[PDB]
Design a protein around this ligand. Structure first.
Ligand code: NA
Ligand code: NA
Ligand code: NA
Lengths: 183, 183
């Protein structure tokens, strides 16, 4: 099954047996991630909430409708990042949205750059997507740099795009196009 | 002295008291190592040979001239690996050579990568080395992957470099440079 390794990390599809570790990761990083993401339900921080979500994701993956990757620190046996491909459409768009997160203690190590690059490559080659879209709040410099480094091209800006922490936030829209897409 | 622990392992400087256990380790891995390393004398595989060797090493440790680390399985109280920093030069090179080995029953667990990573980090930060050199036979894929994972950069190739098991063996030359070295 789908697995990528570099240094002491492993990037792979999330599994049902990840329920506790993924809940631990979002609990651990609750404060760090809170100002950048929409309001989260209680189930989002719990292993029982993730048990249910994982049932849905297994089903989504069966139909090639979603691909939720975790970044594992093999030294620590814990999840330290996520790379999620969602809102996948086939004909006539062949597009998906990518969203990612990283543990607050693993910043500035090029992990997100690598994890996203290897998964985009797989989404293009193994899943035959034509387009991956990403959107980030302009003051999220780390996110901007990652996307630029990976050859995502800025497409414009949607003002007041997503409701986060009680306010509409502008987002830069960016995308990467797969020239080798097969009809 | 210097000590690193992870899982059920400890990486530390070798000591006089290790004479028997280091001997057992090389005697245990004699055959797995013969195709990969230079011919060793008989004394290399005896506790008495190491007593002497250790008296020299203990001395090199004292004047920061050499750092011979062992990897210990704390559960079994056995040495299962080595990481040796030798050929150390201060001004105007600030460089040394790393050589390492792992017990053949302990392969595939990333033990070597972690042992070398944590000690390179110490050589850079606590010993202020500028450069660590490593060289490997191209068909030693296990060694190549360790070095790649730790960010060693290929500098070239030395044909017919070391005489091993009755023939001169080509070696890839690699290094890691400490950008934070202080003059
Ligand atoms: Na953002
Ligand atoms: Na490591
Ligand atoms: Na020989």
């Amino acid at each position: 099954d789908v697995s990528f390794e570099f240094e002491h990390y492993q990037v792979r599809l999330i599994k049902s047996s990840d329920a506790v570790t993924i809940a631990n990761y979002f609990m651990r990083n609750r404060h760090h991630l809170a100002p950048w993401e929409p309001k989260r339900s209680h189930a989002f921080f719990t292993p029982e909430g993730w048990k249910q979500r994982l049932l849905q994701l297994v089903e989504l993956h069966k139909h090639n409708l979603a691909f939720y990757f975790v970044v594992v620190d093999k030294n620590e046996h814990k999840i330290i990042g996520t790379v999620s491909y969602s809102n996948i459409t086939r004909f006539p768009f062949h597009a998906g949205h990518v969203g990612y997160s990283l543990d607050s203690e693993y910043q500035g190590k090029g992990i997100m750059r690598r994890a996203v690059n290897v998964t985009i490559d797989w989404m293009f080659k193994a899943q035959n997507l034509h387009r991956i879209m990403a959107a980030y709040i302009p003051r999220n410099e780390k996110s901007a740099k990652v996307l630029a480094a990976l050859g995502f091209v800025k497409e414009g800006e949607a003002k007041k795009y997503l409701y986060i922490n009680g306010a509409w936030e502008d987002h830069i829209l960016t995308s990467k196009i797969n020239d080798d897409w097969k009809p």
